[PDB]
Amino acid sequence: IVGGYTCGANTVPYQVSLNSGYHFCGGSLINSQWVVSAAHCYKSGIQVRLGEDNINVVEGNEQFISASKSIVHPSYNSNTLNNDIMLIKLKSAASLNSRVASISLPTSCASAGTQCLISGWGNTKSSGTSYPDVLKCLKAPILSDSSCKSAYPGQITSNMFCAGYLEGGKDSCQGDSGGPVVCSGKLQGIVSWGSGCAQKNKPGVYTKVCNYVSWIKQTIASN
Ligand SMILES: Cc1nc2ccccc2n1Cc1ccc2c(c1)nc(CNc1ccc(C(=N)N)cc1)n2C
Ligand SMILES: [Ca+2]
């Protein structure tokens, strides 16, 4: 997260860290046994780390659970990043409490202007690399479709939306990928891609979760 602020320990209870000997992507807990993340975060040997703040120290409240299966959307296209969504089933159910909780799926899509909270342990610098120990947060509004398509001509599909600041300086970044974009208590987006991080006129692009509610429900019900 570039230009954000320290969230505060366990203030984003649905935030997950995908770990394979190091943090590589974020995710969101949607029920006791399922996490939603980005398809491009797919890899084998995934350990889901819940209740985290400092990802380098065991401070208490952490739950490390191996993924039993990762379901990448069948129509995910790695070249266009269309359908960049993945479901991860936990080997065992997470113990839900004050510091580990699930986020609700949306019943409708969010409109332009809606303010959302984006979080993660990704890169904090526009130029260069600096990964934080603790969870960073950022409040950003959903941009209009016209502004989004003007920023990324021919690259925005109906399954994507832009959120952020055209002036640059505040954005999600590499490492935040797969993480949550929560608006009015509903998971509306998944950190997906962008051109650089926090660059002028290059806002972040996110997977439009409202287009996948039926798919998520049908897939979870059959696995
Ligand atoms: C290289 C390319 N071929 C494309 C074809 C169609 C559309 C975009 C395309 N891109 C750009 C692109 C595509 C995927 C990318 C990317 C940059 N950079 C990342 C790394 N993660 C990432 C996450 C968030 C942000 C951000 N909010 N600014 C920036 C980058 N991924 C996971
Ligand atoms: Ca920790």
From Swiss-Prot:
Molecular function terms, GO-annotated: endopeptidase activity; metal ion binding; serine-type endopeptidase activity; serpin family protein binding
Q: Which GO terms describe its biological process?
A: digestion; proteolysis
Q: Does the keyword Membrane apply?
A: no
Give the binding site residues for substrate: 171-172, 174-175, 177
What reaction gets catalysed by this protein?
A: Preferential cleavage: Arg-|-Xaa, Lys-|-Xaa
Q: Which UniProt keywords apply?
A: Calcium, Digestion, Disulfide bond, Hydrolase, Metal-binding, Protease, Secreted, Serine protease, Signal, Zymogen
Active-site residues, record numbering mapped to chain: 40, 84, 177
* Entry EC no(s): 3.4.21.4
Q: Which GO terms describe its cellular component?
A: extracellular space; serine protease inhibitor complex
Query: Which cofactors does this protein require?
Result: Ca(2+)
The record's account of how the chain is modified after translation: Subsequent cleavage after Lys-125 leads to alpha-trypsin. Further cleavage after Lys-170 yields pseudotrypsin. A cleavage may also occur after Arg-99.
Q: Which PANTHER family match?
A: RIKEN CDNA 2210010C04 GENE (PTHR24264:SF15), TRYPSIN-RELATED (PTHR24264)
Tell me what this protein is called.
Answer: Serine protease 1
Q: Which organism is it from?
A: Bos taurus
